Amino acid sequence: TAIFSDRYKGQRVLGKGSFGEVILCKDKITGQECAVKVISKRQVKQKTDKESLLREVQLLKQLDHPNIMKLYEFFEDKGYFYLVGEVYTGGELFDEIISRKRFSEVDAARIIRQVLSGITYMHKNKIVHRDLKPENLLLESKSKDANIRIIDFGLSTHFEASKKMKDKIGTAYYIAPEVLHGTYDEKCDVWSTGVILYILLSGCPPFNGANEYDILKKVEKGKYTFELPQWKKVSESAKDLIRKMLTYVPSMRISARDALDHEWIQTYTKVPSLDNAILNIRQFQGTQKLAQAALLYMGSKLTSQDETKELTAIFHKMDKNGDGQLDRAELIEGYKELMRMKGQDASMLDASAVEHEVDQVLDAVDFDKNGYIEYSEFVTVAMDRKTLLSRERLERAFRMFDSDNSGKISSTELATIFGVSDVDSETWKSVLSEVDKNNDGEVDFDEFQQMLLKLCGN
Numbered sequence: 001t002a003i004f005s006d007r008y009k010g011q012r013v014l015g016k017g018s019f020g021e022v023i024l025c026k027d028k029i030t031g032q033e034c035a036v037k038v039i040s041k042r043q044v045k046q047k048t049d050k051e052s053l054l055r056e057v058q059l060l061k062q063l064d065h066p067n068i069m070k071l072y073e074f075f076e077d078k079g080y081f082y083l084v085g086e087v088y089t090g091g092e093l094f095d096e097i098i099s100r101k102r103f104s105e106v107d108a109a110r111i112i113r114q115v116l117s118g119i120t121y122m123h124k125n126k127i128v129h130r131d132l133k134p135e136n137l138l139l140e141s142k143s144k145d146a147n148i149r150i151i152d153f154g155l156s157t158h159f160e161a162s163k164k165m166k167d168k169i170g171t172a173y174y175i176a177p178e179v180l181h182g183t184y185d186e187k188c189d190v191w192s193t194g195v196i197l198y199i200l201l202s203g204c205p206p207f208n209g210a211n212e213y214d215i216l217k218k219v220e221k222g223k224y225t226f227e228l229p230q231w232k233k234v235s236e237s238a239k240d241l242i243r244k245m246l247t248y249v250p251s252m253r254i255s256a257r258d259a260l261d262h263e264w265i266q267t268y269t270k271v272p273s274l275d276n277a278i279l280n281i282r283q284f285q286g287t288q289k290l291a292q293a294a295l296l297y298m299g300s301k302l303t304s305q306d307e308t309k310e311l312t313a314i315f316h317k318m319d320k321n322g323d324g325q326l327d328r329a330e331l332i333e334g335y336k337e338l339m340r341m342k343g344q345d346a347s348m349l350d351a352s353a354v355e356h357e358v359d360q361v362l363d364a365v366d367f368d369k370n371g372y373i374e375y376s377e378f379v380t381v382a383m384d385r386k387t388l389l390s391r392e393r394l395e396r397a398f399r400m401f402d403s404d405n406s407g408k409i410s411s412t413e414l415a416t417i418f419g420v421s422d423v424d425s426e427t428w429k430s431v432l433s434e435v436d437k438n439n440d441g442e443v444d445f446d447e448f449q450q451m452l453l454k455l456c457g458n
């Protein structure tokens, strides 16, 4: 019967993970910083019963390995689960790798040794990941010597994954064929690691396609090749390990522990730079992140349409006198009422968070916080703070993808982006034709924003 907000306060948002938002939190007594993953019961269903979840959490809190995220505490209330663990500040592995001048098999081997080391340890404890992918590999700190920390190990056994595409970007490339068909075991993690290793050394997914289902069809057939030009740079032993890890029948697939003893791991963690692989990983990364940002922008526009009208109706009802005037305490009460009905905002953990947010909106609008305020003006501002925020995230991702600083995305590139985003081919072309009436075969940022608004009913 211990409450999460009695102990921890939210400092800021760390980002979106599988199953929920991750908030940087701080212990109110000790000052300890923690990364808290907040899982919404309404958004995410459980796969196991109460007893199985508690026992797994209890085990996970005791486990310790340098390549595995450390879990500290678990909480639960009427609407949420709170997974409290150690903060890591190095960011995603692949974002660090694209910022390097050089990258060799020695670097790749040291990365994969770390991932294999962590996996081996968790397998010894009968914990399977299943959803292992580059976004679940965080560097512990910004130091060039930083260890990789694998996150979300063991979670997918207890929670059902989202079917929504905004939560599924990247996932199809890395999933083992046996997970698609239902009978899987710890060997599925060695497959996913094999896919990651294939991409580290070549910069392209082994199983690819024009959309999610085309990727899944390729994974399911299990056929891949080492026939690209950049594979001629690579040692035969690297390709031998990859073959063992991407073996189709799991009983015949190499174990994590035996992969650590493989000739390639032994030789290269004891050579030329892969310039072409770095080039492809940077493009891969930019493409994946812009599709994510596009889907998140479309989502936040829909969330805004929903919340704006809801908040107006909450205040209209609150305004018993009917003159449009409410005070700060009434605005706070109504904003808290919005959080009860929705439960979308992870950063509004308690009453004290919403009070700060109300004050931030009031200080922006230039209205006095100790008198009565026009609520319609408050609603417009409060929602634009989420609307403009998501608008800037999209733009940054547009600039990053546009590595030539051309200012434009070509029609070929839009097909790639919307393929990863799983927006129907005929559907976006229609939206493009509606906005691109000069047959340029390309769009600038504003035109791209306009397409996305049209692809979420606006």
Ligand SMILES: Nc1ncnc2c1cnn2CC1CCNCC1
Pocket (backbone or CB within 6 Å): 014, 015, 016, 017, 022, 035, 069, 085, 086, 087, 088, 089, 092, 135, 136, 138, 151
């Ligand atoms: N333990 C963590 N430390 C810092 N950030 C974290 C975690 C766990 N999740 N997150 C959020 C990031 C957000 C960007 N994508 C990778 C995960």
